[PDB]
Paper text:
The most prominent mutations are in the spike protein, which mediates entry of the virus into cells by engaging with the angiotensin converting enzyme 2 (ACE2) receptor. Despite being phylogenetically distinct, a common feature of both the UK and South African variants is the mutation of residue 501 in the RBD from Asn to Tyr (N501Y). X-ray crystallography and cryo-electron microscopy (cryo-EM) structural studies have identified N501 as a key residue in the spike protein at the interface between RBD and ACE2 that is involved in critical contacts with several ACE2 residues. Mutations that emerge in the receptor binding domain (RBD) of the spike protein are especially of interest given their high potential to alter the kinetics and strength of the interaction of the virus with target cells.
Author numbering:
A (entry chain E), E (entry chain G): 1 to 213
B (entry chain B): 497 to 595
C (entry chain A): 348 to 496
D (entry chain D), F (entry chain F): 1 to 131, 138 to 217
G (entry chain C): 447 to 496
The structure:
């Protein structure tokens, strides 16, 4: 078929800038191209069609150019709500093939996280399983390090991390690290601590609790 | 059944006629149509399944009552009995001659 | 002509040398379906219909018995028992223009597929939403003909 | 005005059958081009099938011979029958109105089709005990399949609600935490309750988080 | 089809009286008629069939008459347990069509309600929603008026009423009026009152509580 | 002796499928006339389908072509398959033995079929604080679909129990209050627990009501 | 699709009775000779049943 190649795979520019997304076809597909915008947890929205013509209801900052093999999507002023995955889609050839997608990231100012630590509920501790949850709220950039301490225990891979998508309101992330233990293997230790290292912090923030309180 | 009933609750007499045809000889037929006998003219005669063309005249040949048709030496039907009125008719070919 | 308004010429009352066509080097596609190609100079037919149009290069395969596409459904349908020959050749040096040649159209929207050898030149606005689309074009009211650039 | 609603997605065994429905409003599907397009989780969009305005149906090479797109005219409904499902068909499916199978201006909300031999399991909901402002939430653990929709206070609180994407555990089950950030003025005076909804197992847990 | 019309739609007679329920067919359906008795929250029970013949186990106070278009169900002595919906059903014509139903109500003596007012539980009041329930117990007739007072507030349509069916034991009703508020819109007022007006009361009964106690 | 038990009813989406079962005792369904008759909530009875003693099946005009009545002889069971459900099929369905599709002497208990795109929701149970005699109860709020069965003290108290019919709220969910009247002699000496059971969402709440 | 069964679609002249032809030379269906190479109007004479 036609292999549709998008560049870059991840695009990070500050708001108010001009973003140029490039799409390349393996063949010449004329001006038979559409662009779609897919928000996280939301269906794709058609932005432009016939490589130049805007869909109604799409704002004027989106535009398109290119022909044959090379095509460009131009966003003349990046705003906060354009954090989405953008797809180019040819429809000249017989199988309709979509592109790989481009994640567009808004570079806001550096925000230090708000750190919370949740002990396991005593409802959960009666079913053999314990989960300590460390929550990092409203931070940027995404690169943060979460080291668990179990009375200074070299914890290695015993946790699972989940990061939300970048917010459309204030461009900040949230992270949740879940540490899972057995009931006889959680209560042999007293004080549980979550240490976080981030760019926006001068010292790594340690939030701890005691089992007995 | 009461006579005060509406249509659809009133009694209906139904007779279902099923005509079945096994390969025994068929004995249920319709009324065989007949027309007035015309003599001394070249007509197409159909007497009891025996068909032909001829002039049907009166005959002096006295048939026996079980016999219906008459044949000459060459096995051609030259005499016949009318089924309506038991009379004998001598079929003669509609006339032919050299010109 | 364009494929939505394809031309038809009734070839009759004449003698046809088919092997000045079959021996022409220009034709990219020459597919005779109901009849052998070399046997055309011997068979005698009551009349011939020549249906001429212009399509894309990738839509040539839809001009065939039993094929299905945009052109087969809404522009030009061949019957399943089709006897005849489909001849196609590249005309990029004639029908193409630097500033665009939008003189060639094709039907994109129709409520039902065409019957074989049916021509539909109606340009009325396609009711795609069954709203009171009282002739005016707009939302859910599409122009049925798209132009081959 | 134009709205497309998918339904019928759920967990199905490999080799099983599933009949997805797409109800439409704002146009008639009997006179429009309709596509089904799927997206694998974490991957890009992939076109599955199309039905034309005249009724011609086309399928991708990976789905040809197994799936069957159709529509039923007197109720304005588009269906996709799915047979002999393999492992790679676990995806979110969207019905989309097209402009002559060129571009898709209107898309449906989408439905998730999960193809695995695992059994449906109802989630366990646990509260996270909270300690200016403070965050509190509930951890939804050990369910199958995706997804679980978490709301707060019957959907009356949508500001500060972070519902994390669920992670696959080493045991094969999913887990997601849902948190809210609440100022200390209403922290000690209001109980926050997370409406956990697992539609494949048909369960809803209104578990209160308390100090 | 055949449209089966029952009269009256609601029949109210004192116990010990003779009740006559009329059923009319759009066509003549001969003696092809059955009668059914449906208690509230209970399947229908066949009473008579062929327009005259009693089902076994049906008491002798039920009888039927009529033919063709007009039919009657006679209950020669109404008792307390016959509060039900009665259906006539033709089965001569090809589609089996039921009647509209007749609700039979027993006219007992006038009983004044017993009035209770339930405050919202503090489990419920912490979840943003408040429900004050005013309960009227063992009254007759059904016509009662429930006016809510929120420190003399002209409450208009902010409540939902639910009435039980008439009891088979003592022919009395019960009503529950639920008033729903928001937590910040319930706690701005102190004293909550439910006023009830009934035929069996000489003055409207006001039952109130205080939020602070 | 004769007893007819329906099962399989529950909430179903529009366009969905549902297979109602009717087990019988006291007679064999393979040699009897059996009907399915439905009653809309607040409306009258409506005949849906019949199966004869020889096996001939008949349907009403509103249900012809969608529903399918059948039976399975070697277990004494009657089924009704229900396909392509519209919004007006939300009703209580009864299987009934007939005397040659004339009159129905024996009726089943009935099962409720709800056709809506709403999700099944488990109820919230709250206690009503009591103040001769006194009334106490529990309020069952915000559930879907019908019904909720409320008992008192494992079903050992049936005198004075008023379970109100549920009202449709403006939010689409139901609410019913269940009350009991208890004299003050046993009010402070006996603990009362209301067994709320919601079988469609599969939940059971044994919530004590206390002074 | 089983493609192991083939039939000779093209030949220069009709077969004699009980004659077998297994030769697979490139058939000339046009004016220009094939010279053993496929091209325009030059086909493999055996086509398989699908
Ligand atoms: C037929 O009917 C005529 C007059 O009705 C009668 O003279 C003749 O004898 C009848 N023939 C037979 C065979 O009954």
């Amino acid at each position: 078929d036609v292999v549709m190649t998008q560049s870059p795979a991840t695009l990070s520019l500050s708001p108010g800038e001009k973003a140029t997304l490039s799409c390349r076809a393996s063949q010449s597909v004329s001006s038979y191209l559409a662009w779609y915008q897919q928000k996280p947890g939301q269906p794709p929205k058609l932005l432009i069609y016939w490589a130049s013509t805007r869909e109604s209801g799409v704002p004027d900052r989106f535009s398109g150019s290119g022909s044959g093999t090379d095509f460009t999507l131009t966003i003349s002023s990046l705003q906060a709500e354009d954090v989405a995955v953008y797809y180019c889609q040819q429809y000249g050839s017989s199988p309709l093939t979509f592109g790989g997608g481009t994640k567009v990231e808004i570079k806001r100012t550096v925000a230090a996280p708000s750190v919370f630590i949740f002990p396991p509920s005593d409802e959960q501790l009666k079913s053999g399983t314990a989960s300590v949850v460390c929550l990092l709220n409203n931070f940027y950039p995404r690169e943060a390090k979460v080291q668990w301490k179990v009375d200074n225990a070299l914890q290695s891979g015993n946790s699972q991390e989940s990061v939300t998508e970048q917010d459309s309101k204030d461009s900040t992330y949230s992270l949740s690290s879940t540490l899972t233990l057995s009931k006889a293997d959680y209560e042999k230790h007293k004080v549980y601590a979550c240490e976080v290292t981030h760019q926006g912090l001068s010292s790594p923030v340690t939030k701890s609790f005691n089992r007995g309180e | 059944f009461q006579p005060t009933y509406g249509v659809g609750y009133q009694p209906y007499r139904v007779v279902v006629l099923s005509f079945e045809l096994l390969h025994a000889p068929a004995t249920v037929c319709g009324p065989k149509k007949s027309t007035n006998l015309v003599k001394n003219k070249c007509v197409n005669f159909n007497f009891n399944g025996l068909t032909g063309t001829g002039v049907l005249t009166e005959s002096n040949k006295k048939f026996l009552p079980f016999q219906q048709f008459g044949r000459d030496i060459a096995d051609t039907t030259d005499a016949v009995r009318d089924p309506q009125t038991l009379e004998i008719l001598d079929i003669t070919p509609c006339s032919f001659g050299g010109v | 002509a364009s494929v939505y308004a394809w031309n038809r010429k009734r070839i009759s009352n004449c003698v046809a040398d088919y092997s000045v066509l079959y021996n022409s080097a220009s034709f990219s596609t020459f597919k005779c379906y109901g009849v052998s190609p070399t046997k055309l100079n011997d068979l005698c037919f009551t009349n011939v219909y020549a249906d001429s149009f212009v399509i894309r290069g990738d839509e040539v395969r839809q001009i065939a018995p039993g094929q299905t596409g945009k052109i087969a459904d809404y522009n030009y349908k061949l019957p399943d028992d089709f006897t005849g020959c489909v001849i196609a050749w590249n005309s990029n040096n004639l029908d193409s223009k630097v500033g665009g040649n939008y003189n060639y159209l094709y039907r994109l929207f129709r409520k039902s597929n065409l019957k074989p050898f049916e021509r539909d030149i109606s340009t009325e606005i396609y009711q795609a939403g069954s709203t009171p689309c009282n002739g005016v074009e707009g939302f859910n009211c599409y122009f049925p003909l798209q132009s081959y650039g | 005005e134009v709205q497309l609603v998918e339904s019928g997605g759920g967990l199905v065994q490999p080799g099983g059958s599933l009949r997805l429905s797409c109800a439409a409003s704002g146009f008639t599907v009997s006179s429009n081009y309709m596509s089904w397009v799927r997206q694998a989780p974490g991957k890009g969009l992939e076109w599955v099938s199309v039905i034309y305005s005249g009724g011609s149906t086309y399928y991708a090479d990976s789905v040809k011979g197994r799936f069957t797109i159709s529509r039923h005219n007197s109720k304005n409904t588009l269906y996709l029958q799915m047979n002999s499902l393999r492992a790679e068909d676990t995806a979110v499916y969207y019905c989309a109105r097209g402009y002559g199978d060129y571009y898709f201006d209107y898309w449906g909300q989408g439905t998730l089709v999960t193809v695995s031999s695992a059994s449906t399991k109802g989630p366990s909901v646990f509260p996270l005990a909270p300690s200016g402002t403070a965050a509190l939430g509930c951890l939804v653990k050990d369910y199958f399949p995706e997804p679980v929709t978490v709301s707060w206070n019957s959907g009356a609180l949508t500001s500060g609600v972070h519902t994390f994407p669920a992670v696959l555990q080493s045991s094969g089950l999913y887990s997601l935490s849902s948190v809210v950030t609440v100022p200390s003025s209403s922290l000690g005076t209001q109980t926050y309750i997370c409406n956990v909804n697992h539609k494949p197992s048909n369960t809803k847990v209104d578990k209160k988080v308390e100090p």
